[PDB]
From a paper:
The breakdown of the biaryl core was initiated by the ortho-hydroxylation of the substrate to yield 2,3-dihydroxybiphenyl (23DHBP). This aromatic hydroxylation was later attributed to a class “A” FPMO, 2-hydroxybiphenyl 3-monooxygenase (HbpA), which was isolated and characterised. Mechanistic studies confirmed that HbpA shared many of the catalytic characteristics of class “A” FPMOs such as PHBH. The monomer of HbpA broadly resembles the class “A” FPMO aromatic hydroxylases PHHY, RebC and RdmE of established structure and consists of three domains: an FAD nucleotide binding domain (D1) containing residues 4–76, 96–197 and 295–374; a “middle” domain (D2), composed of residues 77–95, 375–427 and 198–294; and a C-terminal domain (D3) incorporating a thioredoxin-like fold formed from residues 428–585. In this report, using a new genetic construct and exploiting advances in X-ray data collection time, we have used single crystals of HbpA to determine its structure in two forms: an FAD-bound form that allows characterisation of the active site, and an apo form that, although lacking flavin, gives extra information on the location of residues and structure of mobile loops that are absent from the FAD complex.
Although lacking the FAD coenzyme, the apo structure of HbpA has proved useful in providing information on secondary structural elements and residues that are missing from the FAD-complex structure. In the apo form, the amino acid backbone was complete from residues Ser4 to Arg228, Ala239 to Trp254 and Glu268 to Arg565. In the apo structure, the backbone Cα atoms of Arg242 and Met243 on strand β15 in D2 closest to FAD, for example, each move 2.5 Å away from the binding site in a superimposition of the two structures. The relative shift in domains is coincident with an absence of some electron density in regions in the FAD complex compared to the apo structure. These include density for the loop 195–203 that connects domains D1 and D2 as well as additional loops between the seven β-strands of domain D2, including region 245–249 between β15 and β16 and region 213–219 between β13 and β14, which features the short helix α8 in the apo structure. The reasons for the mobility of these loops on FAD binding are unclear; they correspond neither to substrate entry channels—as proposed, for example, for RdmE —nor to the region of the protein that would move as a result of FAD moving to the “out” position, as also observed in RdmE. The structural reorganisation upon FAD binding is also manifested in the orientation of the loop between residues 36 and 49 between β2 and β3, which moves to accommodate the isoalloxazine ring of FAD. In HbpA, helix α11 forms one side of a hydrophobic channel, the opening of which also includes the mobile loop 195–203, as revealed by the apo structure. The mobility in this region of the protein could mean that it serves as a gateway in HbpA for entry of the aromatic substrate.
Numbering used by the authors:
A (entry chain B): 4 to 43, 46 to 199, 201 to 228, 239 to 254, 268 to 279, 281 to 585
B (entry chain A): 4 to 200, 202 to 228, 236 to 254, 268 to 585
C (entry chain C): 441 to 585
Amino acid sequence: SAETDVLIVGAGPAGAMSATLLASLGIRSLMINRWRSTSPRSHIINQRTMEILRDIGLEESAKSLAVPKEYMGEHVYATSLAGEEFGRIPAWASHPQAHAEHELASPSRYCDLPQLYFEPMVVSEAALRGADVRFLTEYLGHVEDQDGVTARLLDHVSGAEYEVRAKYIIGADGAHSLVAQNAGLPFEGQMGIGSGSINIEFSADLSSLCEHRKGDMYWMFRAALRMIRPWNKWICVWEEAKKIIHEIIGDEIPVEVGPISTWTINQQYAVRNTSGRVFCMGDAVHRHTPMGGLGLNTSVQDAYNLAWKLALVLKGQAAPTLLDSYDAERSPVAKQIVERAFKSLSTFPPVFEALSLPPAPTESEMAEALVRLKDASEEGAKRRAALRKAMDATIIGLGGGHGVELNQRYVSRAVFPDGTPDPGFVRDQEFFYQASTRPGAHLPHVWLTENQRRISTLDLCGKGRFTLLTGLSGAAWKHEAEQVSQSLGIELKVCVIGPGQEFVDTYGEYAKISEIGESGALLVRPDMFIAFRAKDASREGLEQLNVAVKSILGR
Amino acid sequence: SAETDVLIVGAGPAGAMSATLLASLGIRSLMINRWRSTSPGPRSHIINQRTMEILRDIGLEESAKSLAVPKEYMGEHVYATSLAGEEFGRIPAWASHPQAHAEHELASPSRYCDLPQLYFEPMVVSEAALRGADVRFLTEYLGHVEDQDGVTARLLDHVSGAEYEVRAKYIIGADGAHSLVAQNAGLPFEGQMGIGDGSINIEFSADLSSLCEHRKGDMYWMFRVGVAALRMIRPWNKWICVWEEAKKIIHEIIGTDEIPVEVGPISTWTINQQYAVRNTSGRVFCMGDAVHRHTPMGGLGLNTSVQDAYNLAWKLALVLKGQAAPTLLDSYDAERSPVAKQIVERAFKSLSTFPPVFEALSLPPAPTESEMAEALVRLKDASEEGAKRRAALRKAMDATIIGLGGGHGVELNQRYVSRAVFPDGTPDPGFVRDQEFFYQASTRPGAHLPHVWLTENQRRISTLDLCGKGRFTLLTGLSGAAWKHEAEQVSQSLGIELKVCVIGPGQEFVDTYGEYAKISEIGESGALLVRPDMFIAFRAKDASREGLEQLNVAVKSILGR
Amino acid sequence: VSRAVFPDGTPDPGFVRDQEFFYQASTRPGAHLPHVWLTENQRRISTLDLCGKGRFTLLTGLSGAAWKHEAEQVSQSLGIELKVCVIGPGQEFVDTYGEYAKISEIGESGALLVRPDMFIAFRAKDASREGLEQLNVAVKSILGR
């Protein structure tokens, strides 16, 4: 037997990130994993995940191993890699305007970094920061009571079974989570919808076909060809029958075949992610197709939302009520993600409609469509246009869904409403991010300066602590904040932004972006979400802070 | 209880590398470690070409390069009063001198780089597990017993609390400098562990780009203990000082209050010069710091530990698969124990290069702020006495370079002599130039395969890239096609893989520059048999039938059959 | 070899290695000034960067401060500009690597007179008065005066 604070079952990206964050806040975690190693899957890393690595100080590492945005831009649709292109779309915000909306949304950027490298990076940091990490250990089951939970583990090295006592359990096993099964969580959706896919990993120098048109992926109508390491290591998606490959490249280039695997099509999510003392996290509560990068990025953000709350509760600085906001804030996102990824598969058939093709067409029918495309008639013009309209529409699954990625709007006991009407979105909320400074939104990024050197507004804010932001007219918040930290037992950094100060807004972006006068203030959560906002530093505003905080923490 | 082929105790660079390589060759390893994680502490960071070659064989080179600081940022070693104070002078460290750099480029396709063991370790531990090794941290080796069929060790699990047994065919002791595995195996050591009356390592953080970016180096040494060092961990930003808020010893070393400083952990180093005279004791093989414990002068610790693992894995693999007799494992001691003694003696001897600096300034060791100040102004003196002092100091400073990148020979000039190299009946050449300072390429058996550039599809490839992959390789020119057939016969005959490359104009690999012709000391029809670990075990002048007959014998001999 | 180089009495060394394939730095008059790295403000500067600018330049170490005064006297005397660089630990221009010491075939107090076109016209072993007297002659001679 053994005792710890939190038991994390699973060391995929969500469990690992959970361990890292709990270790960074002084909480004892034991992380476990049935398998011998990290996953040998996902690869698009979006801005929200990069911001979190930036908060933890792992951003520079990930960028070192990741392929940059500049190499991810050209999505090509073709007959084969060596054959003729139907056309290209500007993927992963490579279009100048998409890129601008990208830059303004965050200090971080897209990059490609196979889960294969990501996982061990984070598992090793978690152990470095203080988490205990044991692989080849299988969760068999648990029982809860009023004071905590006891789980039974099976050790695949020693052979022994032993018990672990813990105050909480995080179910971060994968898409077949036994932890979710035992906690009794309800799911909606199915796990094999219809055709799945076959994933042939392989190696081959394709620089001559790719360096003049750099992209993350190359899709063929005849299946996908995705880059793992620039122009060199690859998967094909669809034993020496894997010269299906030669067909997809379109013999001349030598090829070593790696492992092959199978994917199914899923659309299932948990309606509720918590069940007294058990919290479930990543693929365990949202299982979906790969369309859009959303799986890994959502999983890490699940862990970022929960850690700080658990920490606070385990230290008596907050009431267990606070843990309910994990479900309120995070379950919607899971449903959203699952529905989005599936819906993104509908954007492909319309490509065949534009070529007048049935699905699974035959080499003849294809060949006809290709020459109709080259036709100098008005019928051929219509086709050309139809194909364009169709191809452009696929972009939602391929970098255009910026709104889905960033426009979280939490509503829970952990955000204190300011009395403002919910504004909607001016533009489409799946395609476009809308910065909001209203409570429940994520803190907008703008550039300030510290010592004439650019710093993001987000760099003022993480570090496992609440932060409160203001201008010079709002010095009063400094004193009001100290009083509240003293009164309730919690850290509360206060930044006064302006001309004299450490942080100044040399560009006026902070003034422009907040929807609020200089003397107003934003209370930012450890997870970077705004929990409270005041118009000004009036005494009515200043009295509210202390209440907002007691309320947020359940006290 | 549990069973596995090899039990590796320790997950420092040698144990981890061992696990990776054995997993890559299809061998079941369990690697264990007392601690909760990889080494956090300030330890090794200079990665030399031999270690980079090995990563290049394993395909981890591009990863390490991504996280490592390049050679170009490592060049300026400055000696000064303080970082903000006045420089006594600079030497061109880590082969930054144009000529040192040429000798570097020619010696290998790889390059120096700085990568804190802190990142190196987890890189390799995760690859080992990915390639098939079982890896368990928080597990302590308590002891073992051997017999005729293998070994049984007792382990203590610090998570579950349980003790259990592990049965294995062999054990690799890669715990550190206090190896309990070495103690139980009964290995003999020579040398001591605390030589005199050591060093304190203060980790800290602070943006020093204004003081360093115009003169990029790995280290900045201060004469002020007489001496203290300031080493870069992440370019201009994360640091250790070497020598609780008394750690503004630091402010003294930087020489200013103005730059804000966050203090990290502090630790202590001692001066060691101790190595094992013998690294093997029936069925137990000891590996890194466990058999060579020494000071940090020259980068040699980590690099030697990884190469210990590269020498052994393939041999263990062959033996465990019945392709080789247990005799082959004796060459680990023959080939590797000398290098341990060499490394330890070199690192310690590199500390003698410092006192002569004080002699050149007429200073006693541990001088006082006044005496120092006098020496500085004598140095600036427009007299002939002052000229002599200047020159003395130069002669002294230059001599320290052996510990700071000049020891290229120590790094690369291994010459194995063991049952695992088959002599060709060439006279031993010596070294034309100093064998500590200068690498000498040799193609004679027992030497490491030289690097030269060939082309595959008009693209440069190293001779070394034809050669690892856990297998023996045989190299030749077109006049030597006969070796192809002879090689097949021997692979069929004994049960082992044996790649053959015929280098030339028509072929896959060609030597577009003539470097292969120039470098081998051998005619086109001759051949080199290269080991998995990149060392030449056999060489033939030509492809005559007398030469061709020998191959089969050399191979049966090397493998003990 | 011409009236515009003042021989220092040193035998011509030859070339150790083939003179078509390999450069040999020399500091003997008639040769081109060798390059080595010095520092100005801890930033690398070439020895050649001390030296052009349409003017004669004279190079020395600290033990050679006497050349500063001697040089001024000669500029005043004949009507020409003559920069003087004293290379060393205190100064503008220091040889942080010791290359200057290593490369010149000359003690610290010695000096090299470099022509506008970067060729050495005069070299002195040291700053003795016999050496210092020569400068004025070397210069009159070089200019035909």
